[PDB]
Design an enzyme around this catalytic site. Structure first.
Site, mmCIF file in Angstrom:
data_model
loop_
_atom_site.group_PDB
_atom_site.id
_atom_site.type_symbol
_atom_site.label_atom_id
_atom_site.label_comp_id
_atom_site.label_asym_id
_atom_site.label_seq_id
_atom_site.Cartn_x
_atom_site.Cartn_y
_atom_site.Cartn_z
ATOM 1 N N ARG A 1 1.744 -15.909 -23.342
ATOM 2 C CA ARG A 1 2.394 -14.977 -22.428
ATOM 3 C C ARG A 1 1.319 -14.051 -21.872
ATOM 4 N NH1 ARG A 1 6.665 -14.918 -26.806
ATOM 5 N NH2 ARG A 1 5.041 -13.694 -27.865
ATOM 6 N N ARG A 2 0.093 -14.559 -21.823
ATOM 7 C CA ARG A 2 -1.032 -13.790 -21.322
ATOM 8 C C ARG A 2 -1.858 -14.552 -20.286
ATOM 9 N NH1 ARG A 2 -3.150 -11.497 -27.246
ATOM 10 N NH2 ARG A 2 -1.198 -10.376 -27.707
ATOM 11 N N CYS B 1 -5.909 -6.732 -2.179
ATOM 12 C CA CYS B 1 -4.519 -6.583 -1.768
ATOM 13 C C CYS B 1 -3.670 -7.433 -2.707
ATOM 14 C CB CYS B 1 -4.341 -7.043 -0.325
ATOM 15 S SG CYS B 1 -5.546 -6.327 0.843
ATOM 16 N N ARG C 1 -0.325 -5.571 -3.807
ATOM 17 C CA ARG C 1 -0.043 -4.140 -3.846
ATOM 18 C C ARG C 1 0.210 -3.635 -2.431
ATOM 19 N NH1 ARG C 1 -3.924 -1.700 -1.108
ATOM 20 N NH2 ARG C 1 -6.056 -2.531 -1.241
ATOM 21 N N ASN D 1 0.567 -5.352 1.674
ATOM 22 C CA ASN D 1 0.626 -6.564 2.486
ATOM 23 C C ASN D 1 0.842 -6.335 3.979
ATOM 24 O OD1 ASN D 1 2.037 -9.859 1.757
ATOM 25 N ND2 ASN D 1 -0.055 -9.083 1.550
ATOM 26 N N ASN E 1 -1.794 -15.158 2.720
ATOM 27 C CA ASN E 1 -1.602 -15.000 1.279
ATOM 28 C C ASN E 1 -0.582 -15.947 0.653
ATOM 29 O OD1 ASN E 1 -1.910 -11.440 1.818
ATOM 30 N ND2 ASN E 1 -3.515 -12.914 1.271
ATOM 31 N N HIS F 1 4.371 -3.616 4.699
ATOM 32 C CA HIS F 1 4.335 -2.963 6.001
ATOM 33 C C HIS F 1 4.041 -3.842 7.214
ATOM 34 C CE1 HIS F 1 0.296 -2.757 4.133
ATOM 35 N NE2 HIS F 1 -0.103 -3.089 5.348
ATOM 36 N N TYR G 1 2.088 -3.025 11.011
ATOM 37 C CA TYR G 1 1.407 -2.078 11.895
ATOM 38 C C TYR G 1 2.110 -1.960 13.251
ATOM 39 C CZ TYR G 1 -2.442 -1.858 8.535
ATOM 40 O OH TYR G 1 -3.212 -1.650 7.412
ATOM 41 N N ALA H 1 -6.433 -3.865 11.621
ATOM 42 C CA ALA H 1 -6.702 -2.480 11.263
ATOM 43 C C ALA H 1 -7.747 -2.521 10.155
ATOM 44 C CB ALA H 1 -5.429 -1.808 10.769
HETATM 45 C C1 LIG Z 1 -5.478 -7.178 2.333
HETATM 46 C C2 LIG Z 1 -6.128 -8.727 2.243
HETATM 47 F F1 LIG Z 1 -7.189 -8.796 1.455
HETATM 48 C C3 LIG Z 1 -6.470 -9.417 3.698
HETATM 49 N N1 LIG Z 1 -7.245 -8.738 4.761
HETATM 50 C C4 LIG Z 1 -8.637 -8.796 4.579
HETATM 51 C C5 LIG Z 1 -9.420 -9.569 5.685
HETATM 52 N N2 LIG Z 1 -8.616 -10.844 5.915
HETATM 53 C C6 LIG Z 1 -7.987 -11.127 7.208
HETATM 54 C C7 LIG Z 1 -8.382 -10.409 8.406
HETATM 55 C C8 LIG Z 1 -7.969 -10.860 9.668
HETATM 56 C C9 LIG Z 1 -7.237 -12.081 9.832
HETATM 57 C C10 LIG Z 1 -6.954 -12.696 11.214
HETATM 58 O O1 LIG Z 1 -7.500 -12.147 12.213
HETATM 59 N N3 LIG Z 1 -6.033 -13.782 11.253
HETATM 60 C C11 LIG Z 1 -5.986 -14.457 12.568
HETATM 61 C C12 LIG Z 1 -6.806 -15.763 12.416
HETATM 62 C C13 LIG Z 1 -7.646 -16.594 13.416
HETATM 63 C C14 LIG Z 1 -8.894 -17.197 12.662
HETATM 64 O O2 LIG Z 1 -8.912 -18.437 12.525
HETATM 65 O O3 LIG Z 1 -9.860 -16.384 12.510
HETATM 66 C C15 LIG Z 1 -4.515 -14.646 12.900
HETATM 67 O O4 LIG Z 1 -4.158 -14.358 14.054
HETATM 68 O O5 LIG Z 1 -3.854 -15.113 11.938
HETATM 69 C C16 LIG Z 1 -6.803 -12.767 8.624
HETATM 70 C C17 LIG Z 1 -7.124 -12.281 7.364
HETATM 71 C C18 LIG Z 1 -9.214 -7.421 4.363
HETATM 72 N N4 LIG Z 1 -8.632 -6.386 5.247
HETATM 73 C C19 LIG Z 1 -7.380 -6.542 5.871
HETATM 74 C C20 LIG Z 1 -6.644 -7.733 5.664
HETATM 75 C C21 LIG Z 1 -5.360 -7.990 6.453
HETATM 76 O O6 LIG Z 1 -4.637 -8.926 6.130
HETATM 77 N N5 LIG Z 1 -4.955 -6.927 7.366
HETATM 78 C C22 LIG Z 1 -5.788 -5.828 7.619
HETATM 79 N N6 LIG Z 1 -5.245 -4.805 8.406
HETATM 80 N N7 LIG Z 1 -7.014 -5.664 6.913
HETATM 81 C C23 LIG Z 1 -4.846 -9.654 1.783
HETATM 82 O O7 LIG Z 1 -5.047 -10.525 0.922
HETATM 83 N N8 LIG Z 1 -3.516 -9.332 2.257
HETATM 84 C C24 LIG Z 1 -3.144 -8.142 2.960
HETATM 85 O O8 LIG Z 1 -2.098 -8.239 3.611
HETATM 86 N N9 LIG Z 1 -4.061 -7.075 3.121
HETATM 87 C C25 LIG Z 1 -3.793 -5.865 3.969
HETATM 88 C C26 LIG Z 1 -2.739 -4.887 3.486
HETATM 89 C C27 LIG Z 1 -3.241 -3.654 4.228
HETATM 90 O O9 LIG Z 1 -2.673 -3.638 5.523
HETATM 91 C C28 LIG Z 1 -4.734 -3.757 4.311
HETATM 92 C C29 LIG Z 1 -5.654 -3.084 3.265
HETATM 93 O O10 LIG Z 1 -5.495 -1.638 3.425
HETATM 94 P P1 LIG Z 1 -5.060 -0.770 2.180
HETATM 95 O O11 LIG Z 1 -4.904 0.628 2.915
HETATM 96 O O12 LIG Z 1 -3.726 -1.161 1.782
HETATM 97 O O13 LIG Z 1 -6.145 -0.868 1.188
HETATM 98 O O14 LIG Z 1 -5.019 -5.149 4.255
#
Ligand SMILES: *C1=[C@](F)([C]N2[C]([C][N]C3=[C][C]=C(C(=O)[N][C]([C][C]C([O])=O)C([O])=O)[C]=[C]3)[C][N]C3=C2C(=O)[N]C([N])=N3)C(=O)[N]C(=O)N1[C]1[C][C]([O])[C]([C]OP([O])([O])=O)O1
Length: 279
Positions: free
Chosen positions: A141-142, A161, A181, A183, A192, A222, A224, A278
């Site tokens: 369990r580890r 992340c 933690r 995304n 991912n 989240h 952006y 960002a």
């Molecule tokens: C965190 C992580 F680690 C991721 N990331 C990294 C780098 N990577 C990337 C970048 C960019 C990209 C793009 O551009 N894509 C494209 C493609 C085309 C080709 O082929 O080239 C489309 O359109 O698809 C991809 C990937 C580092 N940094 C960052 C990142 C992201 O994602 N975002 C940003 N803004 N930056 C993982 O693993 N995951 C996640 O999600 N992450 C994130 C969360 C947040 O937002 C950030 C950090 O901050 P803090 O404050 O929380 O610490 O990130």
């Protein structure tokens, strides 16, 4: 149409309708272009589950799946923190955080490569240890991998992340639970969710277990502000049947895999979508 698309779209809808904005705070992220504060709309504690009857990949947009796998191998197989090694493979998604020494600090690959586990009178890293234990001690369990090393957090260009995974061997099936933690739903998430299901398939092949459940947990989920428009579009697009993932049956050793050993079959998807990053 697909498991991932259905779950993905729903979470995005939730964030867009009930997400909390952080516009009033001094966020850490700044937009790539103008360098202005990059804010988000968010929710917390979200989970995605897959029975592995399908390959978790989005079809509402073009996903750079090859790049995702390359990054995975860079971290888990090569166990390097050299952005340069990654550039060699033709990937520049990490270039923005590359440090003066060309690395991303004592993070990711560096952690997985550290020989800090005692096995048989010798030291092995998290990956080697996990591979051994999964075979010689399934019921444990580890079965955990940890990228979040509290001692070297200050020596990381960017704290991980997706920092942890826990494996379970139950009924001759290998189950995988990973957690993020933080995304970025537009950019990171699609990368991912897929890249880690591939890791499950790889480890399962070299250990001789059947595919179990695949669970993806997200802490800060989240989206952006500048991505909303495209996501609204992406969500209205149609979806296609999930593609099939071919993995070279010949490979019996984890470190023998190469990007050429993976082939997505019948991957039908919508057009590519641009999303500013960002930093
Ligand atoms: C965190 C992580 F680690 C991721 N990331 C990294 C780098 N990577 C990337 C970048 C960019 C990209 C793009 O551009 N894509 C494209 C493609 C085309 C080709 O082929 O080239 C489309 O359109 O698809 C991809 C990937 C580092 N940094 C960052 C990142 C992201 O994602 N975002 C940003 N803004 N930056 C993982 O693993 N995951 C996640 O999600 N992450 C994130 C969360 C947040 O937002 C950030 C950090 O901050 P803090 O404050 O929380 O610490 O990130």
């Amino acid at each position: 149409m697909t498991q991932f698309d259905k779950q993905y779209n729903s979470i995005i809808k939730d964030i867009i309708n009930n997400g909390i904005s952080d516009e009033e705070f001094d966020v850490r992220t700044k937009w790539d272009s103008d360098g202005t504060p990059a804010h988000t709309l968010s929710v917390i504690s979200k989970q995605m589950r897959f029975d592995n009857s399908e390959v978790p990949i989005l079809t509402t947009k073009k996903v750079a799946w090859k790049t995702a796998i390359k990054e995975l191998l860079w971290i888990w197989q090569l166990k390097s923190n050299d952005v340069n090694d990654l550039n060699m493979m033709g990937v520049h998604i990490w270039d923005q955080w590359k440090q003066e020494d060309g690395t991303i600090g004592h993070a990711y690959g560096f952690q997985l490569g550290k020989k800090n586990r005692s096995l048989n009178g010798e030291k092995v890293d998290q990956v080697d240890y996990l591979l051994h234990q999964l075979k010689n001690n399934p019921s444990s369990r580890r079965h955990i991998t940890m990228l979040w090393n509290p001692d070297e957090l200050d020596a990381m260009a960017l704290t991980p992340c997706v920092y942890e995974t826990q494996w379970y061997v139950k009924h001759g099936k290998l189950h995988l639970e990973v957690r993020a933690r933080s995304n970025d739903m537009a950019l990171g998430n699609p990368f991912n969710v897929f890249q880690y299901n591939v890791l499950q398939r790889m480890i399962a092949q070299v250990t001789g277990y059947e595919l179990g459940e695949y669970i993806f947990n997200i802490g800060d989920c989240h989206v952006y502000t500048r991505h909303i428009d495209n996501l609204k579009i992406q969500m209205e697009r149609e979806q296609f049947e999930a593609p099939e993932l071919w993995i070279n049956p010949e490979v019996k050793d984890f470190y023998d895999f190469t990007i050429d050993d993976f082939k997505l079959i019948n991957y039908k998807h919508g057009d590519k979508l641009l999303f500013e990053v960002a930093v």
